[PDB]
Structures are given as structure tokens and as C-alpha cells.
């Protein structure tokens, strides 16, 4: 009976509480304002839309049932494979959105006139359009695999259903493979090279012009442009590794202290993972004055 | 035990 559920401490429920509180509430005003204020600004509002769907989706129900010392799931079978949609989606939006921007200010800042010839802003309006649809079109499969399963021995306890996988663990662990693959490694690696070789122009600038701020104002940008690659690894490697141990390890072993520390890393992984659509506005803030002055007054 | 909570 007591089988299916999880010993992770009521203090450690209780902070996490409090993290996922503090940063829904810094998260949902900063994208907020941000969406509010408004071809760069289309992508950085999508991104901004896509922060702040993800924490209003995954954060609630997560926090209830997922992130907490409770095992037994009550959304419903199809409730269990509309969360991980959803949670899907916004995590694939906000890689491409990401991507995407990064690939905008590329070719903004090293090639200006046919980056306005090609990304006209109906063109930029509907390349983020379709880059919302390929993140929900990516999001299907987990629709038929998150299901609710009676877990219990018995087969009928009071908290038998939970949302766990359905299939047979060799799809679930290639399908997660894939996940890991098309929503990190592909952006990693697109934002890290346009970063680096934008960050790299930004430093030929400085060393050709070497002004009061201008160098500041250059070398502050690099700055950022380089942090955003460090915080998106930071945040988004330990989710992606999670997943992937939960997919690939075998029974054998598995162990009281490995199941135990699984449930402890969720909470951290998790933690990362909301940090990142709570820091995308305080970069937005540090980078440019202007923007900072409208986000204030707004 | 196997965790369930993807
Ligand atoms: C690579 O850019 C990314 C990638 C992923 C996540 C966040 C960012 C931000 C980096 C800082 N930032 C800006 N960066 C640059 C640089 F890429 C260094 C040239 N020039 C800007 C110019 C304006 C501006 N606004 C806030 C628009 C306000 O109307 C932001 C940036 C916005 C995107």
C-alpha cells in the first residue's frame, strides 16, 4: 500500500514551496510588463509570452502534486496527458524563442540590411507564429504517453492512479531521448556559436575604437550575451539529465537511497528550470536603459 | 521501487 509513495521531508516541501512562490511572482509581473511595453521586439515578446506560460501552467499543478510529499495524482487521465503537453510545448517554445532571438541579433548586428530584407515584421510575425505551432506540434507525443496508470499492488487503493508513462520503456526512453536532443542540444549549440561569434564582433569593436560609455556600453553587452549561454546550460542541463536518468537507468540498479535522491533532484531540476523565465526580464533591464526606464514607468 | 514522476 505504502509502495507507491515518496518520503521527501515536509521542511524541504515547505521551502521549495516558498522558491516556487518568490519566483512565480517575480516571473509572472516581469514577463507581464515586458509583453505589456512590447524586428528584435516581436522575438523578445514571444519569448517573454513563452516564460510566462510556462510558469502559469507547470508551476501550479507541479508544485500540488508533482513537487511535494504526496504521490497520489488527481487531474484526471486526461489531465495526466494535458500537463505534460502543455509543459511540452512551453519548454520548446521557450528553446526555439531563445534560439530564434539569438539568430535575430546575429544578423541584426552583423548583417543589417538583408536581416530587415528577409525578416520584414509580418515575416517576423509569422516566423514566431510558426515556431509556437513546431513547439506544439513537437509537444504531441507526450499526449498518448502521460497517462494515469493504478499503480497500487492491490490495483485499487485509494491513490492508485498516478501519471506516469504508459508505454513500454523502450519508446518512452527514445522519444525522451529525442526530447533531450531537439529542445537542448540544438539550441545549445545555436545559441553558443551565434553568441560567441556575436560576442566576438562586439570585442573587435572595442578594440578598434579604443569613449566614456561606449566601451562600457559594449563590453557590459558581451557580458550578457555570453551569460545568457552560461544560464540557459545552468538552468536547462540538470531537467534534461534528470529525464534522461529516469528514462535510461535499469531496475537492478535502482536503490532506496538512488529513489530517494531522484525525488530530491526533481526539486532541484525543477528549481533551475523555473528560474530561467524569472531571469529573462532582469537581463532585459540590465542590458539596455531605454527598456529599463519603459519597464518601470509601465 | 521505480520513480514514476517524470
Ligand atoms: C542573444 O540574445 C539573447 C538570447 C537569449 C536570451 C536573451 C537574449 C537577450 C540578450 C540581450 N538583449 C539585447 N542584446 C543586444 C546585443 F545582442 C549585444 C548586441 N542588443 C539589444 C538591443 C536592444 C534590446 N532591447 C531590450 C530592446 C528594447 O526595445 C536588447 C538587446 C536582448 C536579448
Excluded at chain 1, 503537453?85 to 531563445?98: E, G, I, K, P, S
Amino acid at each position: 500500500s505504502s509502495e507507491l509513495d515518496v518520503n521527501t521531508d515536509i521542511y524541504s516541501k515547505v521551502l521549495v514551496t516558498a522558491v516556487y512562490l518568490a519566483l512565480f511572482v517575480v516571473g509572472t509581473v516581469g514577463n507581464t510588463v515586458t509583453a505589456f511595453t512590447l524586428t528584435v521586439h516581436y522575438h523578445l515578446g514571444s519569448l517573454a509570452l513563452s516564460d510566462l506560460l510556462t510558469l502559469l501552467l507547470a508551476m501550479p499543478v507541479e508544485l500540488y502534486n508533482f513537487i511535494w510529499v504526496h504521490h497520489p495524482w488527481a487531474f484526471g487521465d486526461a489531465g495526466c496527458r494535458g500537463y505534460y503537453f502543455l509543459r511540452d510545448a512551453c519548454t520548446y517554445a521557450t528553446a526555439l524563442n531563445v534560439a530564434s532571438l539569438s539568430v535575430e541579433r546575429y544578423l541584426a548586428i552583423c548583417h543589417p540590411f538583408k536581416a530587415k530584407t528577409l525578416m520584414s515584421r509580418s515575416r517576423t510575425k509569422k516566423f514566431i507564429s510558426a515556431i509556437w505551432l513546431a513547439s506544439a506540434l513537437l509537444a504531441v507525443p507526450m499526449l498518448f504517453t502521460m497517462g494515469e496508470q493504478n499503480r497500487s499492488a492491490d490495483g485499487q487503493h485509494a491513490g492508485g492512479l498516478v501519471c506516469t508513462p504508459t508505454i513500454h520503456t523502450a519508446t518512452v526512453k527514445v522519444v525522451i531521448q529525442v526530447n533531450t536532443f531537439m529542445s537542448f542540444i540544438f539550441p545549445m549549440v545555436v545559441i553558443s556559436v551565434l553568441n560567441t561569434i556575436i560576442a566576438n564582433k562586439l570585442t573587435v569593436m572595442v578594440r578598434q575604437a579604443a569613449e566614456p560609455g561606449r566601451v562600457q556600453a559594449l563590453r557590459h553587452g558581451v557580458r550578457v550575451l555570453r551569460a545568457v549561454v552560461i544560464a540557459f546550460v545552468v538552468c536547462w542541463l540538470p531537467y534534461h539529465v534528470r529525464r534522461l536518468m529516469f528514462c535510461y537507468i535499469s531496475d537492478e540498479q535502482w536503490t532506496p537511497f538512488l529513489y530517494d535522491f531522484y525525488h530530491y533532484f526533481y526539486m532541484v531540476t525543477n528549481a533551475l528550470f523555473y528560474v530561467s523565465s524569472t531571469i529573462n526580464p532582469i537581463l532585459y533591464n540590465l542590458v539596455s536603459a531605454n527598456f529599463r526606464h519603459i519597464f518601470l514607468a509601465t | 521501487r521505480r520513480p514514476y514522476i517524470l
